[PDB]
Amino acid sequence: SRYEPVAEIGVGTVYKARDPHSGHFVALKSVRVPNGEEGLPISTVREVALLRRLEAFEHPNVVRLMDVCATSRTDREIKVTLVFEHVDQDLRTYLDKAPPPGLPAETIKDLMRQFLRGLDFLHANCIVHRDLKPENILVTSGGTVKLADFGLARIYSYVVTLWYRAPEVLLQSTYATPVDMWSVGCIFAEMFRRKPLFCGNSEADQLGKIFDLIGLPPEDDWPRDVSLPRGAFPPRGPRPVQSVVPEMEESGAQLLLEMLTFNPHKRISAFRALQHSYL
């Protein structure tokens, strides 16, 4: 279709448009990829096509990519436009709008179940979001949670908050599937306190902020390759989750700690977190 723009969703730059035949609103995201001797980059062709493949499953917790077009082409660049069904609000807006005391515990558990159902589906289809945040966790008018802005890492590669980054990516040790689970723990805690759990301006300041709650990991727990040494951080002890996260039942804090585990090999998966007694 030739979607006519209506407004600007926000910021790279996403616009809102009305589908000329259906009349439904859509979100347009434009990415720039290099135009090589072999034409479209192989990663761009494979990655976007695989995203299109996910639509057959019709998962309720993921955003739907309904149209893709290579609108522009120059000798050095190809512009690809991605058309997604529009979602009225993002988690951050949803959390901010709610009046005091806060979101009900049942509401939090239902949002967490939907978030984890969507995250497991991506995990099952060999996709790791790698940038899970409240802004990219969209919420529909009905309260359905749909994950967005994932699987485009190769094209997006060829400034941002470190609040949800897993300790391995901050330490530059091992990128992995469990990094999203660490972000889920950050989002989970943020639902109770209505504020980001860890706010760090630097990659080392973020780690220091993490160790203030989770404590300082032992030498055995430390990864084989580390950008920053353990001796660079002061000896901090583990702080109870309840002190920094309010109105959370002990089983919820136990689940939170299973997500906020330093070692990604010991960290709870999305499927295991769905089976937790709290959920």
Binding site: E37, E38, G39, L40, I42, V45, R46, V48, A49, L50, R52, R53, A56, F57, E58, D67, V68, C69, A70, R73, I78
Partner: protein, 233 residues
């Protein structure tokens, strides 16, 4: 399985039009598609391509022909472009544009193939991870009661049948699940004729595979007969 019901849904969205030669194409005829299809199979066999590249490339060609009129002089360019996108989707080392132009005796140049790539990928709305009969043959084989030794021979013959079917216009009308079931039935029937005490999946395999696809056994039987008549030529 729930993945099988998503595969059957996905192939309905990647479906070519059975009337594109009459309704869309003004110069391209089936004989031309057969020649370009035969050429694509020869390039895949010579280049030692992944077996799925050729049916995927044909799937892209039928879908593009269903949406865009193409001059008969540009049909080879379209076949080479379909193989190029299919190679990127299914291979660790994709065929280069110049390796495909070599097989046209350098009548087409890489630049032309890269321009076609944008046209093809856009007309298909980047639905490139399309289901191929090979995806269905694997699902049918796990369900079938055969020893791993027999499944490898069934896999070989069925894939040869899928390649033969792709050259003909019957690849356009029958969805990949149908081409796969017809090819598995044609393969097991042939193997059972050669060894009556082996390949015992033959027995009412048309009805069996029609329950998996939820299709009419008569249509699968007609498909199987079409595939076997093609083998004779």
């Amino acid at each position: 399985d729930r993945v099988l019901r998503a595969m059957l849904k996905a192939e309905e969205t990647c479906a070519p039009s059975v009337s594109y030669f009459k309704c869309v194409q003004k110069e391209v005829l089936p004989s031309m598609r057969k020649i370009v299809a035969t050429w694509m199979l020869e390039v895949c066999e010579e280049q030692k391509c992944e077996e799925e590249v050729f049916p995927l490339a044909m799937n892209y060609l039928d879908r593009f022909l269903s949406l865009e009129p193409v001059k008969k002089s540009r049909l080879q360019l379209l076949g080479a472009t379909c193989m190029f996108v299919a190679s990127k989707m299914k291979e660790t080392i994709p065929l280069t544009a110049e390796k495909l132009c070599i097989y046209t005796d350098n009548s087409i140049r890489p630049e032309e193939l890269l321009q076609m790539e944008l046209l093809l990928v856009n007309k298909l709305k980047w639905n490139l991870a399309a289901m191929t009969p090979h995806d269905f043959i694997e699902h049918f084989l796990s369900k079938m009661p055969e020893a791993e030794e027999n499944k490898q021979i069934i896999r070989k013959h069925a894939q040869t049948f899928v390649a033969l079917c792709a050259t003909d216009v019957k690849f356009i009308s029958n969805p990949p699940s149908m081409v796969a079931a017809g090819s598995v039935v044609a393969a097991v029937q042939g193997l059972n004729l050669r060894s009556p005490n082996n390949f015992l999946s033959y027995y009412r395999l048309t009805r069996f595979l029609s329950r998996v696809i939820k299709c009419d056994p008569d249509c699968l039987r007609a498909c199987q007969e079409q595939i076997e008549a093609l083998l004779e030529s």
